[PDB]
Structure formats: structure tokens, C-alpha cells
């Protein structure tokens, strides 16, 4: 199991950015997909979750980014995507790509500075 | 929808992987209320809610759907489950039933009983890690992680809430991953918010490629709003079948509009409710029913081990019951000791010692019978439900119950026999004391087996108690201390020949008066019939009686149903 | 559910037995996980369910529970333990994290 | 017209009621809703004046302008229970006549019969006036008919303000609707009806005149359903179409005890609703109407009940006749009462069947066993009969004593008076059947002495079981305690198998307070006096066994008989005290 994050850079407030989370070493259609961020001076905070095929690929967001962030997954390439809108105001963090949350946060990724 | 809890998780952690299950009933006509021309077809992923008169007397509609029923048994239609005709094996292998009354041990936590049910349901091929993963997925699916270590105790105990008890029951009935789920009044006696949460949980379970059937008499507004499929059943005949949100539209189209600020379900139930006036409302419901049709592993040893472990864990954690048992045992022992106190200037006579032995033999069986009857009737319903579910075939359950009662029985015997042999100043020594202890233990065990058989033979608590008291009186009068054991013509002689109290008294007499000559031992043994059987013969007779009572109890468990 | 982890900072040398304290606002029935965020950025879970260990985790890490206070005991500390630790709960939605502890040599 | 006024009602003994203010007038019916921990039952009991002695109750209650004190609540406010404890072996007409005789005292039964007929015609109960109550599942009257009979019995006292404790819970939909319609009609017939419903239906919204909602004792809303909908719409929570506004408003003013945040949210919502209601004009209009009715001096006097305090002997005789008619109309009760001792004697005869004359085999041992069985079985049969027949009468007395009809000690005295002759006849026939068959010293004097010595302990045990049932609610614990006490008595006090002359001092002192010792002494003096024994062998005559068991019993036979006969009034006084403390500790 290997998680690689990509898509970090310098953006303007109110713009748009899309992150990439590469999945390899496990079944992408049988496990969940979590997005966890980390502010430079705060604790970890869960952002969104991408359910598996058993939940019809439904999405869910936290009470702080509900409506501005859009997470999607590619089953053909096993790559997770996260469309971020109205960022650079407070959503600047070290966002990581996790695999499972209900079964313990295991097999974390690398994280990129957005 | 906005007044209830909204901070929940809409994820499904334990879904059903396999072919979609189908349930199709065609022209169901039940007889002894009055189901006539019942037909519906549901598939996996839909939640069918049976509102209205969902019962036909003592058995609901879901009972006759599964094949059960307390009333009549004649059928006039066809039931197709997954493309196969109705049969007990199919309903036991694929269909799951969740009764209204829960069956959970109060002395056990959620995780313990869940692991026990998973071990008794999953085959022997699944390793312990797979069972643990299944238990964890079942816990996370119903959001029972905040109470996995808390006890599930019923009333008079702390335990937990009623909704959590219902969730634990659902998880128990859902551990083996059934294809069709059936619940009878799940929101009965629960809070409004708790009922809404339970309805949401059942809807989420049905959404995961499953079939859930709910039977509710008077559903609330928030409960009816979340219904996927609804079936209006009034006096056995169906009126509407389809979506809950389209019921009002169908009633408006058929010419029955719903008034503003009025529940649709209650209005449609009380509009066609049968009361000269009984026949006027009967044709109204038949007209709506007729028009609706025009528009449309693991093994016996493993099960025995799991059962005995569960029984031991439930018994060793019942503090008040064991405390009161020890208290009454100590009270009886102190009474027996201080009443027949032999230490002092005046010693006991022959009649005094005989009465002391007879009381020691025939005073504890009453409380033993009472306690065993109470313990049996406190779990008869749970045992019947577990037998109907198909966990075990009551083969090793007898041995499991025996080996689970043996520790408590031995503890009670020790507590009752310790402060009684030294306070009464009986024959000193180790061998006679051990013989008396073993005889009392065997007699109390035989009485316990007799009480178990009497409880399993009669379904009524009062009738079983009366039969046990009659047997106790018959064995008490048959003793060799009241009627001299000589004035028995044909019936009392044969009654005493099988009465454990008579053999107990004879053994106690032969042990305490062995070659003893007291002033006013061999003369009283000669004039009575106590010398006709040696000690080992009495022990063998007691063992044979215990074996016969165990065989009778096993036969009653295997043949007679334990209907509550 | 708020996860208060104490202390906020800890400094010790190699060979001593260090223990981190994490308290939950509610009852999680033992559903707690421990993370290890290396200074490079790669995070790796060490102990899940506060009782078991993950694959590839050394046997020096152990988890205990005393009432409502979870403790992560680390004995025979090496120089490769300079990282951040965060305790989290996954028994109630949503899953919250802890304050964190910066363990330095 | 009459008017009920409540101002700042509060019940602490932990603040069950928090500033409760209600106002009802004649011709209107007020319904009160709430959750499990709402406290509507406590408010009803405080309005009726029943639970006001356990804890302090603040606030004033104005009726027709005059404020009633804490002692004028019972004779002005009627209360209908929910258990509905009625005698099965009684008709409606006889029950209503007994209720009218216990409540009203005018003279010849003609006026009482006319009043009963009028009350039955008011509630349409003439079709079941000559039918037994029985059980609804065994072929008797339905639950709705039982509730109607209870309402008629409560209206026999001619009240003006009625209270109902969940009259629709436990019934079906049609029966609940009929009960609601009947209560609305009774309220419209120049009366005040204040009832509470757990969860009403949808069609019961436009039938009531005022709807009240309480949350943990705090008044949430109370007013006209139209003004209720108007206030709920102006507050910012419009009721959706086809939503059963009753359940919607119950959930809107409820507390979700499932999480720590949802509970706080529901609490803040309830507080906001209560604050918006306190600043509304409906509460101001209610307070203005209450203040106007308080200082009006136009309404007539406070309407009390037409009941007058009757004589104690009259109530005793009425209760005696009632329990006698209830026992006679129940065949099973008298059958068991007259056949329990007979079955016991037949079971003993099936084993003994005869007594021989041989010291070696069955001379004294069989007689001692028979006497022990009799002494251990007669109180057992008495306790069985008491547990089988008294609890329903105890429940009826507990339900009828709170209304001021009669007392519980009078009911116990009537029960004793009606159980004396039946038990006497049962013991007499049992002794006539069994004592002559066994052949235990056949003689008329010995027969009468044996009859009395088996009748007195039976009554003693029955009265002890009655006392224990009056002091302990659960009949199973009472049965167990009575059985244990009888076993201990027949084991210690009886000198048959214990030799009291050698038992320790504490047991010897305890045996002096037990009737088993006197019974055993009487039986020994009656049996082993006029017969001899032979072995063809410790003893030879009966005098030796008498002197061995009880030496001075021959000279104290009369004293033991007097003690056994005087033990009954002591138990009667004990039961009287037990009931006089039970009617207060509840």
C-alpha cells in the first residue's frame, strides 16, 4: 500500500485547485478514501470522505467545507481527486490522503503544501 | 426532518454481498383477521412497511409470511422466496426474524454476546480473526461503538437504553449476514427521536442491497415520511401497495382526499375501520380493495463450549441472585444448627436425630424447586427463540445447562452443608461426613433435574409450580419418617421406591446409626425397612433415578416445544 | 468528542520510559488510535484500538487504559523516536484528533 | 358558569412543577400533553389533592372566585384512575347501587335506583345494566364499557370538575375516539373536564377547546387550537401538510436524551419557545381573566359534592354485602375455598388410609405425621385462598379509598367477616369427611375439638397472610414469607419432633409466641388421652407419650384453647394498623 499526494502549489484566494492521490498496492474499489489536512499551527482535521463502490461512490464533507470542496475518484486509473474552490483564505494546510477512518487511520501518504 | 439529529454517518460498513433476494406472495388467504387476496412483490433495496391491522389474532402477518403462527395453519396461496417455494429450511437459512421482545442476557456486555452469536452462527472454517472482523463491522454498521463495553441489562439493572437494546438485537440477528430482514414492531416502547433513529438505521440497512420488512400499528408522521414501500392492511385485506408519498395522491385520485393538518395513515386506517353498522363499513373496505386489484458447522462440541461459557459468564456476574441464594442457604443452615444444637449437657435422642436428618433431607428441595423454576421461566422464551432461529438442535444444550448449573449447585451444597454437621454434634469423622455430603449433593442434584423436567414439560408457570409441589408432597409423604414406611399397600410403596427423599433418609439413618447403641440403633433399623438396601445400593438407585430424570428432561426438550 | 492529549511537549534522552496521556470527552469503549508524524512528513500508524499493533511496528510500543485515560508507554527509546504523536477516536462521527505531543531527544 | 383557576403552581418534593398556570371554564375541555418526564400526573394529583402530603405544593387554586384550601381539593375535584380495578363477579346496576350507597345517604333505595338509572341513561349504559363485568377476553364487557362504568361511578357523586389520568391509553382507536367524544359531551353538558393523553390522533385536534403542553413541569403553551396554530406559525415553525400537528408539536417541544449536543439544542429550543409564549398576548389574556374572576364576586358558591358522611356500621354492612355477593357470584372462588382442605385430606388419606394399633409399626408415628401435615397445610390453604382472592379486593379498596368513600380497615374487617363462615363450613365438612374415615378416637367431643383445633389455625394463618399482603404489595414475596413462617412454626413450636423440654432457651421463648405449640398440645391431649397401645415397644399407653411430649398440657388444655381463640383479635388489630399505615406510606 502506497499513497502519493500531488497538486500542491501557490494559488490566489478564490481560485481553484485539484489535488491528486495515487493509490497502489490494494483494491481501490473495496476501501474508503479520506482527506485529512493539517494547519501549520493546529491539530489534524478531517475534511472529506470518498466511500467505496458499495455506497454508490457517495461523498460527504465536514461542516466547514460543505459546498466548496468536491472529491471524486477514478476507478480506471485508481487516482483520487479533490476539487478545491474558494481556497487560500483558510484552507491552506498539509493535506494528506488516508485510506480508512472507521478501522483506524492507517497507511498514510506524503502530504503536499497547498 | 429538521428537528431530529442530523450529525450522523450515512456510510455502510457491512453490506450484503451476493445475489439480490426476492420475496413474492401470490393470493395469500389465511384462515383463523380474515386475510383475503393478499399479494405483493418486493426486491432487495426496498423497505416494505406494513401499517394497519398487521395481525390475525395472536400471530402477525410476518409470522405467517415466515411460516410460523399460533392460530390456524391451513393455507390457500403460494409464497415464493428467491424463486423457491416456502419451506422451513429456506426460511431458516435465508430469512431472518427479529421479534418484538428482545432475548439478551443482562449479565453480559454487547461485545461478549455479539462474539458468542458470531461463534454460534459462523461455521468452523472462519478463523477467530474473521469472526472478530465480522463483529467489528456489525458494531460499526449500527453505530454501537460507544456502548460496546457497557452492559445490555434489562429493567431493574443499569444496562443501557431501549434503542441500544434494539440495536444490539438487530446486530445479533444480522451477524450471519442474512438476505431478508424482518422486524415485528421495532419502535414499540421507544422514544420519538429513538424511533426516528431506528427507522433511519433500518432504511440504511435496507439500502445496502437488502430486504427489510417493518410492521407498525400506528406509525408517526416522521416514521411514515421515511417509508420506502407501504402496504395498508385493514382486517386482513390490502387496500394500497406502493410508495408512501404516493398514497395521498392515490387516495385523492380514487376520490378520498386527505384533510389538511391530519395524518394520512391514521385517517386511512380509521376511515375503513370496521365497527347493522358492521356491515355498512365492511362493503366500504371491500370496495377499495376490489378496485385496487383492477388498477394493478461449527459442530456440537463448539456449540456446547460456547453455551457453557455464556452460562458461566452470566451466572458468575449475577451478584444479587447469588447473594440472596447464599443468604437463604446460610439462614437455613443456622436454623438447622441452632434448633438441633447437640453441644451442651443434654444430648440429642433418637427421634430428635431422625427428625433432624429428615428435615435436612426434605427442607431444601422446596427452595431448590422454586429457584430452578424461576431460572427456567426467566429464559424459556429466549431458549425457544434460539431453538426456532436454528442455532442448536438442543442436543448438547442439555449437557451445557447441566455443566453450567453444576458449579452453582455445588456452591449451594457446600454453603448448606458446612454449618450443619458440626453444630448438630453428629457422628465425628471424615468418611461419614463425606458420605453425608455426597448423598445430600446427589439428592439435591436429582431434585434439580426433576425441577428442570417439570419446567420443560409444562408451559404454564403456575401449572408447573403446582405439579412440582404435588410431586414434592408425594415424595415427602412417601418418606420412612411420617407414615412409618409400612402402611403402604400398593401405590405408596411404589411411590417411595422411586422417591429420593426416602432413600436419602434411609442413607442418613444407616450412616448415623451404624453400630450405635443409644439409651432410651439396630432395633429401629430392624423394625423399619431401612436395612433392606445397603449404602452403595442406595447410591446406585439415586444415580439411576437421576439418569432417568435427565433422560425425561432431554425427551421433553427434544419433543415438547417451550412455548412461552 | 474532544481529545485532550497531555503533555503538550516532552523531552527525554535515550533509554528512559516515556508515557503520553490522552483523555477523551466521552466513552469510546477502547476505539482509539495512535499516529506518528515524522519530521519529513510521512505519517505512520503505530497502535490501533489502543491494544493491538500494526505490521512493521517495533514491540517497544504498548498501549494501556486506566479508566477514562489512555496511556501510550514507550520503553527503551531510540534516537529514531523524534516525531509527533496524535491520538484520535473513531467510535463516534465525526472522527476527531488530539492536541498532539512533540517528542524530542 | 363555573371556572377553574390555577396561579403559579409549583411542586418541589426536585421541582416537578415550575410555574404552572391553567384556567378552565364551563363547557370547555382542556387536554394536557407531555413526555414521560413531563409531570402531568403530578399536576393532576396536586389538583385533586392526593400527593400533596408527601411534598410541598405551592400556588393557589381559585374555583368560582373562592380559593380552595389544601383540604377542599378532595370534595371538589374528582379523579379517574387508569388501572380500572372493578369486580368481575358483579353487574353494573349492583356496582352503581353500592357506590351510591357508599357515597350518598338519603333513605329508601328508590332514589338511589332512580339516580343510577339516570346516570346510565346519560352515558347510554342501559343495555349492559343486567350483565356481569367479567373480562373483555373471557366474554364479559369490553374495555370501553368498563371505562364508561367507571365514569358513571365517578359521576354518581355529582361532580363539576373531573380529572382523567390517561383515559385513552391501552385501548384501540375506535374506543379511544368514542371515549374522547363522550368526555367532550360531558364537558359540554355544563362541566369541566381536564384530561391527559399520551399521543392523540389527528381527528382529535379540532374536538378539544384548549390544548396544554408541559415540558419538565414548565408550561409551554395553553390556549385555543386555532391560536395554537397561529402562535406556532408566528414563532417560525410552520406545520407541514399531512403531518399530524399533535406529534409535530410534541416533538418540537421535546428533549432528545440521546447525545450531549442534541439535548442542549432541544433544551435551548424549548426555552426559546417558552420565552416566546410568555411574551405573547394569550398568557396575558389568561392572567387578566384569572384576575377578573378572582375579584368579581358574581359567580355562585363553590359546587361541592352531594355526598354526606355516613355511619361506620352502614359502610361496614354495605362492604360486607358487596364482598358476599362478589364471592357468591364467583363459583370457582367458593369451590376452591370449600374444596382445598378436602383435597388435602384426600391426598393424606391416599397415603395413610388407616391407623393401626402396634407400637412397632404405625401407632404414634402415623398420628404425629397426620397432625404435622394438618398443622402445616391449614395455614397453607388459608394463604393460598388469600393470595387467590384478596389482591383484587385490595386493589379495589386502594382505588376507592382515595375518593373518600370508605377506609381500608373497614374493607379488611368486611373481608374477615365474609371469610369467617365460608372457612368455618369448609373446615367442618373437611373434618366430617376425613376425621371419621381415619378413625382417630371416634367421639363427638373429640370430633368437635379436632374441628376447632383445625379451624382456628386456618383463620390465624389466613389473617397473617392478609396482614402480609397489606404490608407487601407483591403476592409472590408474601406467599414465600408465609410459607417460610409456617414451616418455621411447625418445625420449632410443634413438640412432635423437637422435644421442647430439651430445645435451647431462645427457641423455647420463640415457641411461646407461636400458635403451633398450642395446636400440637391440644391435638396431643385430644388424641393420646382415651386410647391404649400394644406391641404384642417403648411406651404402652397414651399418658406416657403425653407426659413425654407435653407434661402440663392436660391441665392447660383450656388455657391453650383460650390463647388460640384470642390470637385472632390480635391479628385483626395488627392488620388494622398495617392498613392504617399503608394508606399513608403509599
Residue numbers in the entry:
A (entry chain C): 21 to 134
B (entry chain B): 25 to 56, 86 to 328, 333 to 353, 392 to 615, 626 to 669
C (entry chain D): 22 to 126
D (entry chain A): 35 to 47, 66 to 588, 600 to 649
Sentences copied from the publication:
When we disrupted the hydrophobic character of site 1 by introducing the I419E mutation into G8 or when we substituted a bulky residue for residue Ile529 (I529W) in G5 to provide steric hindrance, biliary cholesterol levels decreased by over 50 to 80%. Thus, the mutations do not interfere with the folding, heterodimerization, or intracellular trafficking of G5G8 to the biliary membrane. Furthermore, we purified G5I529WG8 and G5G8I419E from HEK293 cells and determined their structures at 3.5- and 3.1-Å resolution, respectively. Although the cryo-EM maps of the sterol-like molecule that is attached to the protein surface in the vicinity of residue Phe433 of G8 are similar to the WT protein, no sterol-like density is present in site 1 of G5I529WG8 and G5G8I419E. These results confirm the important roles of G5-I529 and G8-I419 in substrate binding and provide further support for the premise that sterol binding to site 1 is required for sterol transport by G5G8. The cholesterol in site 1 is close to Ile529 in TMH5 of G5 and to Ile419 and Leu465 in TMH1 and TMH2 of G8, respectively.
Cholesterol is actively excreted from cells by two ATP-binding cassette (ABC) transporters, ABCG5–ABCG8 (G5G8) in the liver and gut and ABCG1 (G1) in macrophages. Members of the G subfamily of ABC transporters are encoded as hemitransporters and dimerize in order to function. G5 and G8 heterodimerize before exiting the endoplasmic reticulum and trafficking to the apical membrane, where they mediate excretion of cholesterol into bile and the intestinal lumen. G1 is abundantly expressed in macrophages and exports cellular cholesterol to extracellular acceptors, especially HDL.
